[PDB]
Amino acid sequence: SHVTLPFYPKSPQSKDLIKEAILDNDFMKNLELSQIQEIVDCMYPVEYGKDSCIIKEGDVGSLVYVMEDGKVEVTKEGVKLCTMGPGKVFGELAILYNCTRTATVKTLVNVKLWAIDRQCFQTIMMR
Amino acid sequence: SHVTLPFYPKSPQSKDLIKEAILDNDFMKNLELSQIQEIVDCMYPVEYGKDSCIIKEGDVGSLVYVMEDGKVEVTKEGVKLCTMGPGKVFGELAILYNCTRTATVKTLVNVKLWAIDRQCFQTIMMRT
Ligand SMILES: Nc1ncnc2c1ncn2[C@@H]1O[C@@H]2COP(=O)(O)O[C@H]2[C@H]1O
Numbered sequence: 001s002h003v004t005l006p007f008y009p010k011s012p013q014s015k016d017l018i019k020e021a022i023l024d025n026d027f028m029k030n031l032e033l034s035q036i037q038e039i040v041d042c043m044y045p046v047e048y049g050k051d052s053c054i055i056k057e058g059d060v061g062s063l064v065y066v067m068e069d070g071k072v073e074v075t076k077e078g079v080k081l082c083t084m085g086p087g088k089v090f091g092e093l094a095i096l097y098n099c100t101r102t103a104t105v106k107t108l109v110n111v112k113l114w115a116i117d118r119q120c121f122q123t124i125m126m127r
Numbered sequence: 128s129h130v131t132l133p134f135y136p137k138s139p140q141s142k143d144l145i146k147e148a149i150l151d152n153d154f155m156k157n158l159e160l161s162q163i164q165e166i167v168d169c170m171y172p173v174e175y176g177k178d179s180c181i182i183k184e185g186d187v188g189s190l191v192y193v194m195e196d197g198k199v200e201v202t203k204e205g206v207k208l209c210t211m212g213p214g215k216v217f218g219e220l221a222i223l224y225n226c227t228r229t230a231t232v233k234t235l236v237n238v239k240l241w242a243i244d245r246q247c248f249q250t251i252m253m254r255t
């Protein structure tokens with residue numbers, strides 16, 4: 001008996017965008033392509049209106065995100081670090097390294113995201 | 128044709144302690160019992176004194192460790208990330224994410240560890 005990872009059907013554009021977002025991320029870019037494929041398939045969609053706090057610094061984290069549409073701002077202790085648009089990963093640090101969120105992430109406009117949780121991610125790492 | 132993995136004889140007591148540390152690990156929980164047993168068999172003992180740097184961030188990582196005794200401190204560019212005590216695994220990230228060491232690991236007291244090299248660990252993961 002092995003657990004079946006949930007599959008979320010996606011458009012090819014979406015799959016390409018997720019794959020390129022991972023390959024753009026310094027910390028995830030070296031994962032096997034086969035693992036990236038499984039991450040792509042397991043990611044599920046989530047949506048936020050503007051001025052939404054997706055991630056609060058210091059919280060425990062469960063999800064890594066890929067941005068499909070929109071723009072976020074990353075701040076730490078009130079200080080703007082950057083902004084991110086489509087094709088970018090965020091919220092990966094807590095999941096990769098098992099720490100609390102290292103920064104806060106808010107939406108500047110509406111956003112569409114893809115998300116995958118640690119548990120699913122770690123299973124994929126072990127295959 | 129097929130690599131024979133090293134076997135390191137160990138007391139039953141040590142096998143148990145290593146098995147527990149592995150079963151306590153997020154990633155390692157995913158493995159089959161038999162793979163976990165094979166990891167236990169491939170591990171070999173290594174010790175470090177107080178104030179040793181076992182793992183330096185940015186290096187190539189070819190070893191995964193279980194800590195039997197002792198306490199260790201994890202840093203990144205000088206900044207304390209956390210500490211880890213007995214029964215914990217460390218050094219698995221470089222292997223699992225296929226990258227250089229993501230943090231620096233220094234001993235806070237004398238430690239006693241078990242180590243498995245990357246070849247064995249990956250071989251065992253492949254052999255489901
Ligand atoms: N200095 C930075 N520059 C760009 N993004 C950052 C920076 N610091 C933190 N982040 C992002 O903000 C996220 C907050 O949650 P995480 O710590 O899980 O992962 C973090 C990164 O994705």
Ligand SMILES: Nc1ncnc2c1ncn2[C@@H]1O[C@@H]2COP(=O)(O)O[C@H]2[C@H]1O
Nearest residue numbers: 097201208217218219220221228229230
């Ligand atoms: N918060 C952390 N960030 C990065 N590595 C950590 C952290 N906490 C513990 N570690 C361990 O530090 C190890 C350093 O080598 P690795 O990157 O191979 O594997 C890493 C983890 O096992």
